């Protein structure tokens with residue numbers, strides 16, 4: 618009886634195995650755009666993905682992860698609200714059973730169809746597992762997806778999904794360029810938060826881009842054909858793998874714009 622996205626083991630249950638679920642800096646949150654403070658001291662975000670080395674894609678039973686070589690300083694995030702350098706380790710998405718829901722963060726209570734998370738760890742901690750034990754260990758770049766035009770840069774991810782349909786499947790996935798998933802503007806909101814799945818650790822500086830990317834209906838339909846179950850188990854479609862907005866508590870969301 619492990620955690621998941623149901624009935625009986627979904628977000629509303631996670632606190633019993635992971636009591637930090639009711640902590641003081643949990644994510645995601647609703648971004649109330651009127652009460653986010655513009656902060657002129659924030660810097661432009663610096664995304665340097667020109668040497669990124671993707672390796673593999675994995676269905677982990679909750680989502681799929683596209684994983685990167687993070688053994689050298691090759692795909693890094695810095696600037697923005699960050700001190701120091703953060704190295705890309707993986708990206709993944711959260712999405713819905715319908716186009717009207719699927720994002721984790723919301724904007725004035727608006728849900729997007731999905732949300733991409735590019736996960737980076739602070740190099741001052743040497744590796745991901747030590748970084749998640751620190752309050753400034755990770756920086757997660759979150760990007761909303763709406764359904765409209767296709768995203769050509771997403772298609773190579775969509776096409777490999779039938780090879781990793783069920784939990785525990787992986788496939789070679791080299792030469793994937795995550796620059797092809799970025800919108801045109803890097804204007805962002807930022808606040809201190811947490812991983813949005815167990816272990817729910819309070820180690821993340823969240824950076825949420827204002828401008829969503831568009832993906833097609835056919836692209837998001839292929840996400841919804843994945844499965845949470847393993848091969849030879851009854852089919853449980855991988856949909857609605859998002860945690861709802863959590864209490865903001867004693868936190869300020871800052872805007873890099875306006």
Ligand SMILES: NS(=O)(=O)c1ccc(C(=O)CSc2ncccn2)cc1
Pocket residue numbers: 734736746749757811812813814815816
């Ligand atoms: N949804 S998210 O907040 O971007 C997010 C959520 C979970 C992760 C994980 O790596 C979970 S697995 C993991 N393994 C060891 C220590 C901490 N987490 C990474 C990013």
Ligand SMILES: [Zn+2]
Pocket residue numbers: 709710711734813
């Ligand atoms: Zn995530």
